[PDB]
Design a protein around this ligand. Structure first.
Ligand SMILES: *[C@@H]1O[C@H](CO)[C@@H](O[C@@H]2O[C@H](CO)[C@@H](O)[C@H](O)[C@H]2NC(C)=O)[C@H](O)[C@H]1NC(C)=O
Ligand SMILES: *[C@@H]1O[C@H](CO)[C@@H](O[C@@H]2O[C@H](CO)[C@@H](O)[C@H](O)[C@H]2NC(C)=O)[C@H](O)[C@H]1NC(C)=O
Lengths: 233, 86, 88, 233
């Protein structure tokens, strides 16, 4: 049978700075002192958590929640409970969140709704924690005094539904761009500030691992609006 | 052969930055035209600290640090002599 | 007027992940005619990266005491250009 | 008349994570919960603090304390107290410390001795906060299979009291080296991994500002121990 890992206030007590800052700088309080976030005064309800684990890498977990008007706090709970507790704060209306993992350990997710002042309502019990993509791409040239290239990238997905992604892109004459794709029906990655005849490369990290994908940006004669709005050898 | 000799320099960036002193390699003649000596700009990240919600700190998913602030910093790191993009 | 291929030695860009544990996660790496005695070198440049809790906090070069115990800054040489300097 | 800025527990309460973390990994406790660091339960004594301001930059202050067997905590106190509170933890036996400033504001230093677990004894009231160096250098060549150059640097000081410095050094064929010199009777800066006939530069930041100082490492004929143990004209 599986185990369960209840919240530890004696340790959770130390996330108050984080929680109070993340709300102090967001809600813009007169001071920080008016943060009445107390982990030792918070209880535990019979209510099971509505959280759902959508993805997990061996160094992280990405989950979805129901859209809430209030802030949401999430923590990962272990048995030993010695190290600082992994946690994440989901901003209201937003529904996707991520929690980082340290070493191969079982954790249990616990969720909370935060008050305006940062009052924690009782914890809700969550769930327990424990071959090559092929990419197509399209480009569009745009005119504004000079000209600029925007490039959109897409790739096929496996049969499974639960898939998140991590994207990295670089070109010989454009500064690096990186992104993290939450689970969607069909992933897509936009790129900007590209140029003509540039030898680029893009890495796509997914459930099936890393896919390194070299690609070259098209020439002017390949882009009709470029060729037409320029001299034509 | 076809290269420009470069000069090293230091960037202070104040004591508020974790990487305070930064190494900058400027262009300080051979490699005559059509090639001309350019300075290769390279973007590095510096960790400054507490300000009044200034700009947007480069993505460091805010947990432990808004006490500190990440900023991009392009700096000369070589003197190339390529004819590309003049 | 212009010759091709150019005198300059080719340089290819790549990304270094260094894991999510690094504050600067994604690192830009520029790896590699001009026949001998010269050979194309990769220009090494030292950048600073910060380490996380998992470490015993080894010797940092120099960081503010607010960032000891939990963090450590370490130097990291990386290719940042390709240049035609001979060996030795 | 001058002012005073007493400790604010309502805000200092939030440094507990920092203090307990910085001590949890250092003193290596079984867990984090056993810290028992409480800023709201600590008082204020008649005992004046022994701290002394040795240096101050327009963004920092460097001070000295008396050697204590226990840890020492130091904080800077303002009237408004909205931004995070500057603080520093002096490790036992060590005597020099630094406190960071962000804006042009008056602060007051407050010091404490920490228990084995980090229990704060009552605060002690401290003090209030509010042309070109000339450099000489010497080198030594060393032999072991290959050869290595070590270079020592020194510069003069004004008739002022307690000067701190910040030094940065770089060479054409050696990676940068930087250091921070606390106030000494006579400052000195060591350099290693130097090579022959190398065009170097060193910057010395002090009370009188920055002093950039170019310099070249000597040739072999200039270093007797190099010339003698090598082939000659
Ligand atoms: C996207 O479609 C390609 C096209 O086949 C898939 O590539 C195959 O991958 C398997 C291994 O997983 C190989 O055995 C096949 O040989 C590959 N096909 C070809 C033509 O070489 C790829 O798996 C698909 N990706 C996803 C995520 O579904
Ligand atoms: C180190 O010694 C030099 C040598 O005199 C000092 O240089 C003088 O600096 C003053 C300004 O404070 C000038 O008015 C003089 O003309 C300078 N003289 C020379 C010969 O350079 C220098 O100030 C000293 N540095 C320190 C930190 O005491």
């Amino acid at each position: 049978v599986s185990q369960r890992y209840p919240p530890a206030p004696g340790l959770l007590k130390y996330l108050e700075q984080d929680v109070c800052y993340s709300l102090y700088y967001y809600l813009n309080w007169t001071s920080l002192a008016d943060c009445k976030t107390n982990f030792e005064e918070t209880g535990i309800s019979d209510v099971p958590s509505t959280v759902k684990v959508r993805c997990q890498s061996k160094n992280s977990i990405r989950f979805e929640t129901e859209p809430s008007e209030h802030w949401q706090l999430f923590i990962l709970m272990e048995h030993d409970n010695f190290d600082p507790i992994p946690f994440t704060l989901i901003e209201p209306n937003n529904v996707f969140g991520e929690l980082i993992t340290t070493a191969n350990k079982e954790y249990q997710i616990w969720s909370t709704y935060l008050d305006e002042y940062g009052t924690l309502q009782d914890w809700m019990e969550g769930p327990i924690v424990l071959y090559n993509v092929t990419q197509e791409f399209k480009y569009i040239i745009l005119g504004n005094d000079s000209y600029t290239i925007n490039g959109k990238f897409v790739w096929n997905t496996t049969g499974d539904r639960d898939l998140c992604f991590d994207i990295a892109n670089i070109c010989q004459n454009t500064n690096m761009k990186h992104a993290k794709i939450w689970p969607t029906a069909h992933p897509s990655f936009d790129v900007e500030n590209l140029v003509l005849n540039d030898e680029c490369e893009i890495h796509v990290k997914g459930i099936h691992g890393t896919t390194k994908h070299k690609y070259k940006t098209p020439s002017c004669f390949e882009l009709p609006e470029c060729f037409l709005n320029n001299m034509e050898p | 052969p076809c290269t420009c000799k470069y000069k090293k320099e230091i960037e202070d960036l104040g004591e508020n930055s974790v990487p305070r002193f930064i190494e900058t390699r400027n262009c300080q003649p051979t490699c005559r035209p059509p090639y001309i000596c350019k300075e290769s700009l390279y973007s590095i990240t510096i960790l400054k600290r507490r300000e009044t919600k200034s700009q947007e700190s480069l993505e460091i998913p805010n947990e432990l640090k808004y006490r500190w602030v990440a900023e991009s910093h392009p700096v000369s790191v070589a003197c190339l002599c390529t004819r590309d993009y003049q």
